[PDB]
């Protein structure tokens, strides 16, 4: 199969155009094969989000054929971004935050990343408390509160995939993201990483968030590594640590990794893929 694709993160802060565009050039030059453009954070909110992402996507498209993902759970943002040149929707709510999102994805013949969102699945969970509310979902959740994380992920994807099917999104256009670092305990995050192959066995490509995750940073700090991101050494250690997770992921055929620091993950991908693809 093909080596792991590296998807670089571009967050457009609410001049912003030019900074996003600078980072786009940087990540492309470091070997990103995809860019994930995000503008998050009512009609006023949607319009402001559109005005962040659409300029950037048009600008990037003029000088690059790179695959562009629009990172939004809002159908209106996705529709506008796809029209402007984005190739796929990265939906952190996995089609559960907006009932219109499946139709938008289908009509555009676009690809979609369906993220498992444990925050929406377990709103009262201790790890989810500090997160915002995603979405414009689930009935009276009681069951979800109890379920072992892998069972809950399956339950969530069953619902999300049903939504994709009644919209007519082709199965081959769907990627799954297990939602690492989104309202999960340390053990759960590690279990989901351990069991990436089980997720892959479902038959969809995996889009994996490996970058600057709190549980990984906690492994470093408890083992004596500097982790302060306002130091050169801490900043570096954080990215190297994420790149170790990419090494593992790429070796087992994960199709896409979503990352901040493309260069460090390129090292990991090239090593890991050379091994995986030895014969």
Q: What features would you highlight for this structure?
A:
279 residues; alpha/beta; TIM Barrel; eight-stranded parallel beta sheet; 12 helices; globular; EC 2.5.1.15; dihydropteroate synthase activity
Largest sheet: 8 strands, parallel
CATH topology, by name, is TIM Barrel
CATH class: Alpha Beta
Characterize the overall form: globular
CATH homologous superfamily classification:
Dihydropteroate synthase-like
Estimated share of beta-strand residues: 5-15%
CATH architecture: Alpha-Beta Barrel
Query: What topology, given as strand order, has the largest sheet?
Result: 6-5-4-3-2-1-8-7
Question: How many individual β-strands?
Answer: 8
Element string (H = helix, E = strand): EHEHEHEHEHHHEHHEHHEH
Helix count, per DSSP?
12
Ends: how far apart? 12 Å
Percent helix range: 40-55%
Radius of gyration: 18 Å
- By secondary-structure content and strand pairing, the structural class works out as alpha/beta
Number of domains: 1
PDB class: transferase
Keywords: antibiotic resistance, transferase, folate biosynthesis
Assembly: monomeric
Entry title: Dihydropteroate synthase from Streptococcus pneumoniae
């Amino acid at each position: 199969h093909a080596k792991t694709v590296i998807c670089g993160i571009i967050n457009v802060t609410p001049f912003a155009l030019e900074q996003a565009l600078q980072q786009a050039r940087k990540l492309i030059a470091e070997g990103a094969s995809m860019l994930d453009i995000g503008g998050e954070s009512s009609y006023v909110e949607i319009e402001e989000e559109i005005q962040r992402v659409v300029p950037v996507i048009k600008a990037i498209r003029k000088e690059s054929d790179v695959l562009i993902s629009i990172d939004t759970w809002k159908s209106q943002v996705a529709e506008a971004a796809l029209a402007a040149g984005a190739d796929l929707v990265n939906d952190i709510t996995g089609l559960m935050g907006d009932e219109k999102m499946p139709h938008v994805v289908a009509e555009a013949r676009a690809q979609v990343v369906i993220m498992f969102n444990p925050v929406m699945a377990r709103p009262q969970h201790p790890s989810s408390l500090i997160f915002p509310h995603f979405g414009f979902a689930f009935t009276e959740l009681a069951d979800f509160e109890t379920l072992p994380i892998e069972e809950l992920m399956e339950a969530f994807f069953e619902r999300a995939l049903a939504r994709a099917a009644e919209a007519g999104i082709a199965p081959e256009n769907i990627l799954l993201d297990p939602g690492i670092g989104f309202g999960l305990t340390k053990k759960e995050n590690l279990l989901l990483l351990r069991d990436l192959d089980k997720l892959h066995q479902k038959g969809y490509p995996i889009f994996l968030g490996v970058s600057r995750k709190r549980f990984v940073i906690n492994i470093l700090e408890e083992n004596g590594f500097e982790v302060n991101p306002e130091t050169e050494l801490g900043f570096r250690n954080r990215d190297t640590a994420s790149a170790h997770v990419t090494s593992i992921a790429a070796r087992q055929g994960v199709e896409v990794v979503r990352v901040h620091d493309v260069a460090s993950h390129r090292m990991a991908v090239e090593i890991a893929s050379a091994i995986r693809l030895a014969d």
